[PDB]
RNA sequence: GUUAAAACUCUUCUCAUGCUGGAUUCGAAAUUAGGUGC
């Protein structure tokens, strides 16, 4: 039980176009592991042949929540808006920015800012897997949101650290959306190439917060 | 294999107008068409 902890640098900005007109705050890792399957469908892979399932724990790609600038990291209920337990920002709306193109309107984060990586590999033939790609994107580059192939949303990882998991006992703050049949809507997607298949997989569950007994787990749901 | 995928912030618009490198200062300072032969 290995990790692949990353500080991943915009270069350019992302997007992602949440309900009735909200857009993401940080990119999510349901877009790390979408990017990451293109990228190991077109690397020809076990880990490509396997991303079609979403119950596929094993890799488990958790959100990617923002670093501050006092080395840690933000915590978001109830607040469309992240913070830190250092107390110096409060990472936000501010960060959108509306880009009025041809006919397009739209809103993005802007670039420049550093957002974590974070893969907990059970096993270890899915490390290997996931060192192939992470000396792949190290070389080029991975595209988290829509307009994928304008140009939006490239990140550079600065950072490839193999660390280890010690695994966590509470009865604990989610870090991301879980997704217990309470009130939270999550939506996502589950586009099939080489099947001509793209279909919007709803859901409803928990908002990102306090949570209480096995936990024998925890990339929509999070927590630590 | 990312609420995916698709859509260029594009078109139109001359740093242009006004303002003279002008003003001061003499090519002059020195030197016998001289020497020879009714």
Redesign the pocket.
Known sequence: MKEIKGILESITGFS????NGEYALYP?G??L??????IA?NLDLPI?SK??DFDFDDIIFRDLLPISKCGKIFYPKNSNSLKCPSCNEIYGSSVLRNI?????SYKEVIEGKKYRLSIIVKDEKYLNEMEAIIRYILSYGI????????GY?KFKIKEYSIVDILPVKDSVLLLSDAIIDGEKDI?????????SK?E?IRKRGKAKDIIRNNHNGFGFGEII
């Open positions: 992602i176009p949440l309900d999510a349901r877009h592991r979408g990017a990451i399957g293109y469908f490509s991303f079609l009025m193109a041809r006919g397009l595209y988290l949101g829509n307009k994928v192939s304008k949303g939506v996502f997607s589950k586009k099939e190439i080489s099947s793209f919007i």
